[PDB]
Amino acid sequence: PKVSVLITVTGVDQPGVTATLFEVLSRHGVELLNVEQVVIRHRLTLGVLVCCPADVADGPALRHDVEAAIRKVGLDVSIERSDDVPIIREPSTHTIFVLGRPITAAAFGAVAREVAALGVNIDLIRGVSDYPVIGLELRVSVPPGADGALRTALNRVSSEEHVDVAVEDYTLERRAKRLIVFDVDSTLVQGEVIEMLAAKAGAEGQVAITDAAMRGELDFAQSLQQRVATLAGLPATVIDEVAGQLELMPGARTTLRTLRRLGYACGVVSGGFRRIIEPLAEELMLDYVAANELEIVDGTLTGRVVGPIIDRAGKATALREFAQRAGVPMAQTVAVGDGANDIDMLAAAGLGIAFNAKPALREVADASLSHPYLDTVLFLLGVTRGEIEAADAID
Amino acid sequence: PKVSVLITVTGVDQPGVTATLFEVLSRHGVELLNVEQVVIRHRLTLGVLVCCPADVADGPALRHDVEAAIRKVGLDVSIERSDDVPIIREPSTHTIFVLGRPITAAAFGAVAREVAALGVNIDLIRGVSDYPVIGLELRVSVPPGADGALRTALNRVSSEEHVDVAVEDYTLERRAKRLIVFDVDSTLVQGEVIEMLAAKAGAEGQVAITDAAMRGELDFAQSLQQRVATLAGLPATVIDEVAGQLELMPGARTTLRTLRRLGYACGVVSGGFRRIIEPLAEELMLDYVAANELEIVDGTLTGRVVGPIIDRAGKATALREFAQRAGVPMAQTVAVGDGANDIDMLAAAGLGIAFNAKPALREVADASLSHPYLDTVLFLLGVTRGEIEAADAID
Ligand SMILES: [Mg+2]
Ligand SMILES: [Mg+2]
Structure with a gap:
């Protein structure tokens, strides 16, 4: 080993090419510095950077052995002196x-x-x-x-x-992201819980305000107060009823299951209600829940929430809390949400992902997803569909 | 979109090739199913699987546009009907x-x-x-x-x-490994602490037994008792003295620093002594320590250890303990050791790595490293040197 030689093999892939080349190179004083090989649509590219004696590389024997062995089976090969060439590519x-x-x-x-x-x-x-x-x-x-x-x-x-x-x-x-939080309504779960609750009061229409709040048209807390007020007089039984009507977003189970494989801490941060969310978080085996709480008197909703109110700043505060408890730096946290309510949380997270989101969030989010599949989040986290399917088929 | 077409571009890499191809394809009704591209030693391979109208793919216009655009700048291109071809390669x-x-x-x-x-x-x-x-x-x-x-x-x-x-x-x-434990002596640290201690008693020679123990020639506990007995009569001051003489294994700091970047929990499990190791674990900001403990009377070593003794089974027990506290499944744990003392721990870990190890461990370990650089562990964990250097240069 004293001088550097680059060998590049290209052409239609065939079995045994790799072995053949290094077997040929072994007849010469060759030590390896870098190997890169891929086959794409049956096209082979094999680039081999070696060190060999100045004796060997300044003679036609190495060239003839390599060229004869590679060309005979029908591929191309080039051989050239290096010395100034990068050993290994930069990340x-x-x-x-x-x-x-x-x-x-x-x-x-x-x-x-x-x-x-x-x-x-x-x-x-x-x-x-x-x-x-x-x-x-x-x-x-x-x-x-x-x-x-x-x-x-x-x-x-x-x-x-x-x-x-x-x-x-x-x-x-x-x-190396290690912690993720999801907004609940229209992110982890289909539709809006508070709209499902208001429908029981015959007020689904008015509760307009939810679309107003999520686009950023008004203060979250005041929109929350006007919306929850429409529930005044409903029996508390409605809570369990709505809880049982919840549908997960397409791909949600796959999303959580795959994040568990990767060792993520998983949580939810919501302006919705703990009594409806805790039932579901336990089922989904989540690590953290932050939510608002409905006031109940004599088994009846009063139409108010019990403070503190999880507002826009509050969602970021909950994320910070979660990350601190879990020992995860903010740079390694992920947050997924759809509404203007999620702006501070997404901004605080290492990676803020807007999922089918109002324009207000889409414009400040690190990344936006526009398809109605929550598992597209996984692709943003470096997972491939093939990897998901492989791990799922093994259980 | 109705029929599938494969386009394969190869040859000497040039700027603009990628853009040019899809710009050409846009003049036809083309939707993309898969793209793969790499450049290795200035050789380009770009494989593009598309769907387009049966109208388009059964005409020579698509072919002429693509072939003319690619060949003019000096690369090769092939175009062929697919329909039976895999869309995306398996992991x-x-x-x-x-x-x-x-x-x-x-x-x-x-x-x-x-x-x-x-x-x-x-x-x-x-x-x-x-x-x-x-x-x-x-x-x-x-x-x-x-x-x-x-x-x-x-x-x-x-x-x-x-x-x-x-x-x-x-x-x-x-x-997605998330937890690692290192043996201390001859793994994280150069040489054997107990030999450094015995040298102070003029007994370095006898303490033979350490090489006997590490190769698996005798029971760890009894070898430990014979070796620590040689310290009887030494002043406890020797502990701090030896602690200050410890040299980290080449690459150890880089190893730990990089594992911290990746969010690993890091710990040490040793048959050595807590008073010498805790001083170093705090400095290296480790998460867990298991070790033995020297008996001291009137500021003098008695030559015994204070039970429980961390033996071969004990090291695995400590790993299990650590992993349980950290919430990491055993399959996602890594253990690094050099001696027969480490056999159960390495076997228990998801990935058991023998580092410059006695034959007894090398034969049961998942992987073996024979070079005197602890950071070669990082390569086994999916890290490249380029990635280490990149992250280190950013601080
Ligand atoms: Mg929402
Ligand atoms: Mg050791």
């Missing part, structure tokens, strides 16, 4: 997830154009899902300070091309 | 780490041969380190039930070719 700085149903060629084309415009190099592309949504990952190297400009460009691409596009730090630290 | 079942200094071509060749012999497919190869040791990862798909035969074949390759070879489950669950 990517960021990763980009593109989700759609469909993902048009125009959409992906726009992503690639914006990326190229900002001097961002594409290091790798791969599929992460074929169901319930098409999912594609690009690992990239962003020029320093440009990731702000990148997220903006891709958010514009996202709205224009009807796909979800999320840019994430791909560093060792910032991608 | 790998296992991963194999090859570490060496050097890794000869003969060594890697032997790994590839054993792999091919057992019908194992190589899905991907990449470098994970160039320092302090050459590190290569192969992600593979092992035929069901054959991974036992594989580890045996590669352990033989390992001893014969002078490289470390470790085979690991590559499932979602079994690779």
